[PDB]
């Protein structure tokens, strides 16, 4: 199984990668690139493409990260609609979408106290708002979990148990 | 005296400004303004004349932030050279711009002790290439600090004193 992992900062995004890997013991890798997110669509279609063969690992950050924080930053490759459908093609039957997210006003509360000098206030409700637009707009099934309301814990053991079950699980 | 502070995050801009305002009695005030910084360039320049005017105040991060992650951001306007100057003109007379950086290393090192997630991991180069090249092309005097050699408390101790010794100061 390719578990996706998917969402804002402050949502313990790598500690639920952490506790999935020593658990299903998968490698864990990192598909977001700032660097090849600038050098050109080209390179940046072909990264994600090379992702979408690994199998039984997890990936911190996928195609769908990208289909948003590339409405922020200048200078920043995002996949075609054909480019998205093709990789999404490619993981249907291997990929389990997992989007950490939880409310603006709890991010930003989490933001304050870890420290951040350049939080916007409001920035991050488009962030969320945008994530979940992404996330609609998607080709596969999508899992998501409120990390203001589960713990790091009880959301990797639910994703853990999924997985698991996937032998009896038929992509259609 | 106008305290004018500019530099990346995990500098402790924020604690530098602290102390200052409990010292010499200033007031403080954020220049940066996202929101605005996106509305458009008429309302920005409009936003920093008006704290321009403002004195006996420290302003975390001003014109210069601006000049710099407006390189960085989509839909980000940014002060035109002529409007610079103008503002730099306004307050000549009663600027102290202060750079507190810190060696890309060292911010990292910072940056990975706070827990980012989005860290690039060179974006930071460019950020710190970028802003010593803004205070090189200033209309004022500039006075940077490394935050990686002296402490929050040395570098306030130094500002300080230069803001009590300004009367006899004359700027030509």
Chains 1, 2 share one sequence.
Not at 110 to 131: C, N, P, T
Request: charged share 30%.
């Amino acid at each position: 199984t390719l578990i996706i992992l998917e969402g804002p900062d402050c949502c313990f995004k790598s500690t639920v990668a952490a506790k999935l890997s020593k658990e299903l013991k998968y490698p864990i890798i990192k598909g977001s690139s700032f660097e090849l997110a600038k050098s050109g669509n080209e390179k940046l279609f072909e990264h994600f493409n090379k992702l979408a063969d690994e199998d039984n690992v997890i990936i911190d950050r996928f195609v769908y990260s990208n289909l948003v924080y590339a409405k922020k930053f200048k200078d920043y490759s995002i996949l075609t609609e054909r480019q998205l459908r093709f990789i999404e093609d490619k993981i249907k039957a291997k990929a389990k979408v997992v989007y950490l997210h939880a409310d603006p006003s709890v991010i930003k509360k989490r933001l304050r106290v870890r420290g951040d000098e350049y939080i916007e206030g409001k920035d991050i409700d488009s962030i969320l708002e945008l994530y979940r637009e992404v996330m609609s707009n998607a080709g596969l099934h999508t899992y998501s979990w409120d990390t203001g309301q589960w713990s790091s814990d009880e959301i990797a053991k639910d994703i853990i148990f999924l997985v698991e079950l996937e032998h009896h699980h038929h992509h259609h």
